[PDB]
Amino acid sequence: DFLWPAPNEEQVTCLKMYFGHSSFKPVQWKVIHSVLEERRDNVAVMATGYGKSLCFQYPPVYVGKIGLVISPLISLMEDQVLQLKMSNIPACFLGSAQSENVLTDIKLGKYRIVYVTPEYCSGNMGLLQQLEADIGITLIAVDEAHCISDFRDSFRKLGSLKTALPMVPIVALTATASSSIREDIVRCLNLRNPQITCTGFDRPNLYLEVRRKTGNILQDLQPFLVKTSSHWEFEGPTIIYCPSRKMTQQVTGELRKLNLSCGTYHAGMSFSTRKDIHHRFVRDEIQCVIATIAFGMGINKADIRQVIHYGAPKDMESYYQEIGRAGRDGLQSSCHVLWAPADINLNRHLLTEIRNEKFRLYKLKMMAKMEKYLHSSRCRRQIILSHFEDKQVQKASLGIMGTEKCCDNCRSRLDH
Numbered sequence: 215d216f217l218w219p220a221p222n223e224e225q226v227t228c229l230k231m232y233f234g235h236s237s238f239k240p241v242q243w244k245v246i247h248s249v250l251e252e253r254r255d256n257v258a259v260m261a262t263g264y265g266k267s268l269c270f271q272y273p274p275v276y277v278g279k280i281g282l283v284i285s286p287l288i289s290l291m292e293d294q295v296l297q298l299k300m301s302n303i304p305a306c307f308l309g310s311a312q313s314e315n316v317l318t319d320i321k322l323g324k325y326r327i328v329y330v331t332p333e334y335c336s337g338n339m340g341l342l343q344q345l346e347a348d349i350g351i352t353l354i355a356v357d358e359a360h361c362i363s364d365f366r367d368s369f370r371k372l373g374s375l376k377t378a379l380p381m382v383p384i385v386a387l388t389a390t391a392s393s394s395i396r397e398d399i400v401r402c403l404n405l406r407n408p409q410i411t412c413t414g415f416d417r418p419n420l421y422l423e424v425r426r427k428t429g430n431i432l433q434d435l436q437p438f439l440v441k442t443s444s445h446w447e448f449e450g451p452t453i454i455y456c457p458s459r460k461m462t463q464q465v466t467g468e469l470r471k472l473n474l475s476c477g478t479y480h481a482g483m484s485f486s487t488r489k490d491i492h493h494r495f496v497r498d499e500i501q502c503v504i505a506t507i508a509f510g511m512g513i514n515k516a517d518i519r520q521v522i523h524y525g526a527p528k529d530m531e532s533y534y535q536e537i538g539r540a541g542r543d544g545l546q547s548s549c550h551v552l553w554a555p556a557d558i559n560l561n562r563h564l565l566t567e568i569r570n571e572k573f574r575l576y577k578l579k580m581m582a583k584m585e586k587y588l589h590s591s592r593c594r595r596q597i598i599l600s601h602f603e604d605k606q607v608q609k610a611s612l613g614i615m616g617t618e619k620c621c622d623n624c625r626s627r628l629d630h
């Protein structure tokens with residue numbers, strides 16, 4: 215880190231005025247400096263809540279050119295376009311349903327960040343070459359780039375990017391430090407001598423706990439409630455993750471027996487609906503969001519104190535991203551799984567519905583790994599971190615591990 219140059223005054227000024235931060239995080243700066251000043255391909259792995267979006271939003275804003283962001287999650291791109299607009303950064307989603315006037319303005323440099331799907335991107339390389347020649351593309355970002363190894367044939371089409379745009383660096387974002395996924399990303403995207411970075415994965419302010427369902431929803435959730443003389447309330451802002459819309463309706467119906475303010479959050483909700491939930495949750499006009507999806511502005515909030523998984527999670531990478539929505543302000547939060555053996559069998563049936571055998575076998579292994587996490591008598595955090603590091607993490611390596619704030623098993627081993 216000693217070798218890296220510090221950001222200069224213009225760069226920090228830009229960071230403060232358009233993104234509202236006083237300093238870059240260390241790995242953000244490594245990626246940004248590498249892409250912006252060294253023009254190098256990057257594969258970057260960042261913890262939840264670290265700040266991965268800044269890595270591709272900042273460079274084109276600083277130089278006043280175009281950053282191309284490729285993602286399959288259209289609703290999430292819509293959400294990020296709105297957040298950028300609220301910060302006076304012009305951005306748009308570009309697709310086949312977009313108006314000609316937006317495309318006209320993109321060709322004139324009016325938009326700093328252009329979001330597209332891999333499908334649209336693969337059939338419009340001619341447009342991207344015109345943008346490169348007329349305006350200049352600072353970088354191309356591919357998050358969900360693991361999909362190139364949930365596999366998506368749409369991502370393999372991105373292999374033509376480096377042919378059409380040999381001068382444009384690509385930033386690939388992925389969830390784990392797995393070398394096998396990284397090798398597929400480099401191969402499929404044709405990256406050249408990419409810079410590889412990893413923040414590490416620990417969220418030390420997230421306490422981990424697993425407990426058994428008791429047979430009744432209200433009995434399960436009562437420990438997370440406080441009863442003022444006037445009314446019931448959650449201890450703090452809370453997300454309850456459910457495995458289905460049906461379970462969401464069941465959980466929500468029970469919470470409303472106590473007149474608790476909540477909202478639901480599902481895939482397929484409109485832009486307006488997502489904006490309404492974001493507004494009410496951020497302003498604490500609702501105390502709880504019961505969710506079947508783990509991304510989007512509906513659950514983007516700084517002070518989530520409690521995450522509850524109502525039912526056994528199916529895989530440890532989804533679990534990590536779901537609990538990572540908590541504690542973004544750095545203050546103490548708690549993450550509880552409530553599970554029953556019956557969950558595991560329903561989990562087992564949903565994986566038999568996976569057609570592709572290789573993907574189904576991978577998912578079945580991820581479930582077995584999650585089942586071992588739920589049953590463990592050892593440190594929960596050590597198990598999760600080892601999966602993301604793709605190697606056994608030593609307990610002595612982090613000060614949080616083995617303390618009363620680490621996890622239920624660490625706490626119970628100390629309290630007796």
Ligand SMILES: Nc1ncnc2c1ncn2[C@@H]1O[C@H](COP(=O)(O)OP(=O)(O)CP(=O)(O)O)[C@@H](O)[C@H]1O
Nearest residue numbers: 235237238239262263264265266267268509510542
């Ligand atoms: N240099 C910096 N200093 C302080 N906070 C920063 C920061 N860069 C980013 N952040 C904040 O860190 C948080 C994490 O941002 P990030 O881009 O990872 O959101 P995210 O993980 O939800 C992307 P996605 O929606 O794809 O999951 C945000 O609240 C962001 O404002």
Ligand SMILES: [Zn+2]
Nearest residue numbers: 219247251252
């Ligand atoms: Zn340099």
Ligand SMILES: [Zn+2]
Nearest residue numbers: 593620621624
């Ligand atoms: Zn522990």
